[PDB]
Design a protein around this ligand. Structure first.
Ligand code: NA
Length: 490
């Protein structure tokens, strides 16, 4: 037998079917980073931070909403596991550039996917750690590059991805594989970040607008009429999805079981103690199938401060927990995530958390395009109201346009509301719309960060010197050329 079999050995690159298998494998390595995509993009912001209602300890997870991560407890370690994925993409890239077995079309589509994914991972690294090492070759000591050089590489990889796809906006392998529309969404985000956080200005906002407009024109995408069906177990493959992480029976639980372990309530206290608004014990309801732990607790007051009446996204996003009082009344306790309801497998007693985790969907294209328009001093009204109309329902929205349609959603609802403000300011209206549309989708922290330090420090406990993440001890030991992130001394 062979004592030194490696994945770079030529016999594993002899057929198109092998390159396909290796591309499936790359999407499976990206999926291993999916819990980290959520942690990087959301819980440092304002949605969490209250005490788990049922009694759980938070066991360090509070360090995210409290922004108390530091050199001893970094919250996430080892650059979120991203370099392992990047190394393997780098292998795909060299093998595809070298092959004599693929069609020119097929080789170029693979290069579109692999350059897109590599840019996607470097852009999480840039926004989270800043200066980071640029590894571009497969390997079976090194200093980080300045953030400005990281951004150069991400933009080069976007251009190489576009070159690979050409004019093909199809989802060749489906919406759970990378495609041109995913490259164009990342291009919109990257040039907004370049333009706003790295001094690119108007020219970059125009690049971002042109990319997002290319998805509206050329990709097969549409808003689902029912916001809850965007996330339903059965309705994966729906045409609002641009790129999603596919979770599946016997393949991968959502966030490698860390959705269940952080955001799903415990069956024991739900069935023993709590009830719905009508006083019915959860022992008696489909909720009695949920069995996880709450380590990140949505702020109790967010449940009534996030959404205007009539917004269908409130019930799709959160369930409220109540408790019967000795005096007989039913009292509101706290909310839990209802966006990802999993499935009850045949003959099971507890839910399985097998929803896909969406990375890019058409409402995000529309709201990014609104943001690029607003940053250019142009009118964001049409995109904002396309997304609101879906949220409220067409007829209800039309009847109530003088209070719900942009730029009329303002007034008393906002007065003591730390989460969101009225439509009188375009960027606040868009932040507000993104907060309502993408709870539990890993966006809020990055949405504040793009707009700048003052937006972050206003609404979060983060301070301006510590917007990046620290680096854990084992990383710094293993690589003497790396420095701790700035802001994280003493
Ligand atoms: Na603050």
């Amino acid at each position: 037998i062979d004592p030194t079999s490696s994945i770079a050995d030529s016999n594993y690159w002899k057929t198109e079917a092998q390159f396909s298998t290796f591309n499936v494998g790359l999407h499976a390595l990206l999926r291993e980073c999916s819990f980290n995509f959520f942690l990087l993009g959301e819980p440092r912001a304002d949605i969490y931070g209250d005490v788990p209602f049922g009694g759980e300890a938070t066991q360090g997870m509070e360090r995210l909403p409290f922004n108390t991560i530091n050199k001893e407890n970094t919250g996430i370690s080892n650059f979120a596991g991203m370099y392992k994925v990047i190394n393997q993409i780098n292998l795909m890239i060299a093998k595809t550039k070298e092959t004599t077995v693929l069609s020119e079309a097929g080789k170029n589509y693979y290069l579109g996917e692999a350059y897109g994914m590599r840019a996607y991972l470097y852009f999480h690294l840039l926004r989270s750690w800043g200066d980071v090492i640029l590894y571009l070759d497969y390997t079976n000591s090194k200093a980080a590059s300045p953030a400005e050089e990281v951004m150069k590489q991400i933009k080069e990889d976007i251009t190489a991805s576009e070159k690979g796809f050409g004019s093909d906006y199809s989802f060749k392998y489906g919406r759970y594989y990378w495609s041109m529309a995913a490259t164009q969404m990342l291009k919109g985000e990257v040039y907004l970040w370049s333009g706003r956080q790295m001094g690119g200005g108007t020219a970059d906002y125009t690049t971002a607008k042109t990319a997002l407009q290319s998805i509206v024109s050329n990709a097969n995408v549409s808003l689902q009429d029912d916001f809850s069906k965007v996330f339903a177990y059965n309705n994966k493959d729906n045409s609002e999805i641009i790129f999603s992480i596919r979770n599946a029976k016997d393949e991968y639980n959502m966030w490698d079981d860390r959705f269940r372990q952080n955001l799903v309530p415990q069956q024991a206290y739900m069935t023993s103690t709590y009830c719905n608004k009508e006083g019915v014990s959860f022992k008696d309801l489909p909720e009695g199938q949920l069995n996880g732990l709450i380590r990140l607790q949505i702020r109790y007051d967010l449940y009534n401060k996030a959404f205007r009446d009539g917004d269908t996204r409130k019930d799709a996003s959160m369930t409220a927990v109540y408790q019967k009082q000795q005096d007989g009344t039913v009292k509101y306790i706290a909310p839990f995530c209802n966006k990802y309801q999993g499935v009850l497998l045949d003959g099971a007693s507890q839910r399985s958390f097998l929803n896909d985790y969406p990375i890019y969907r058409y409402a995000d294209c529309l709201l990014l395009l609104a943001e690029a328009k607003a940053l250019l001093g142009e009118d964001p009204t049409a995109e904002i109201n396309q997304v609101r109309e879906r949220a409220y329902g067409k007829e209800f929205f039309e009847a109530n346009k003088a209070t719900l349609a942009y730029p009329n959603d303002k007034g008393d609802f906002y007065t003591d509301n730390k989460y969101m403000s009225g439509d009188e300011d375009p960027l606040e209206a868009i932040l507000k719309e993104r907060m309502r549309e993408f709870m539990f989708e890993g966006k809020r922290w990055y949405d504040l960060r793009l707009l700048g330090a003052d937006y972050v420090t206003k609404r979060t406990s983060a301070v301006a010197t510590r917007l990046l993440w620290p680096i854990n001890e084992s990383v710094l030991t293993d690589n003497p050329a790396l420095k701790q992130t700035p802001g994280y001394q003493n």
